[PDB]
Write a protein that binds this ligand. Structure first.
Ligand code: CL
Ligand code: CL
Lengths: 158, 158
């Protein structure tokens, strides 16, 4: 697992364009926010991602990049990304390598057997250390957007 | 690796609505067209499904049913189904059970490590026997739509 003191597990996932994205390596020096979401094309996940899209400027200010992660395939995540005018990166963890690594692998009672991510948020600092964690078993609850921003800002100052 | 004459491997996958669908048990009597496609939201698969969509009249009067199968999650496939006004059912082989059972598991040259279906078409008769087969590793080629229609007609007349 990932705990509030450990370096963030180094993972390599492909984005909606099929470009490899190395986390946290490719983001040394800047604060990164990993937003794990259950399934693309769902009310709550759409809302959550749209919310991050909208606050995109606030994040640019503090040199912070938000990355969405779901076990969905790249092609669907791409379609998902465009339809909601999302402009931060979205990567496909199709082998569940990330959900497992970050210990947020779960299952929807309604779709047993389908392994997906529990809506969670992880903020990694400029040095690749996890400094904030939030996980919800209930996929209807959204993150504490404000609390996240505050932490991103505080982390950006070090 | 199924072949002409064999009994269609029984598979149970959920549809865009999360309802289990069983093939070819649930369709004993009718002729079924299994349309395996690599991925939702891609030019060639979007074209191929659209083609079956537009010729659903011809199928429903020889009493045949077309079924879409991809390893995409039910959520994405749903959005995929609606956004293209698709009518026939589309099931999710999220655990590659059917692609393996039918021997059509593979990868897109464009994305190594992602196991998906090779675009392929299987035509099961009224008794559940595989009568027509077509597979293409090249994710670029489309099926022989008329050749499929001919076969479905001939098979319905038994
Ligand atoms: Cl969700
Ligand atoms: Cl495709």
């Amino acid at each position: 697992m990932v705990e509030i003191g450990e370096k963030a597990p180094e993972i390599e996932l492909v984005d909606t364009d099929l470009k490899k994205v190395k986390i946290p390596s490719d983001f040394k020096g800047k604060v990164v926010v990993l937003a794990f979401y259950p399934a693309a094309f769902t009310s709550v996940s759409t809302k959550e991602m749209s919310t991050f899209r909208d606050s995109m400027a606030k994040f640019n200010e503090v040199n912070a990049v938000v990355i969405g992660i779901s076990v969905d395939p790249p092609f669907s995540n791409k379609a998902f990304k465009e339809q909601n005018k999302i402009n931060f990166t979205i990567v496909s963890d199709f082998n569940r390598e990330a959900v497992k690594a970050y210990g947020v692998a779960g299952e929807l009672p309604i779709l047993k057997g389908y392994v997906l991510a529990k809506r969670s948020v992880f903020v990694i600092d400029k040095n690749g250390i996890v400094r904030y964690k939030w996980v919800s078993e209930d996929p209807t609850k959204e993150p504490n957007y404000d609390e996240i921003k505050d932490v991103v800002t505080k982390l950006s100052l070090e």
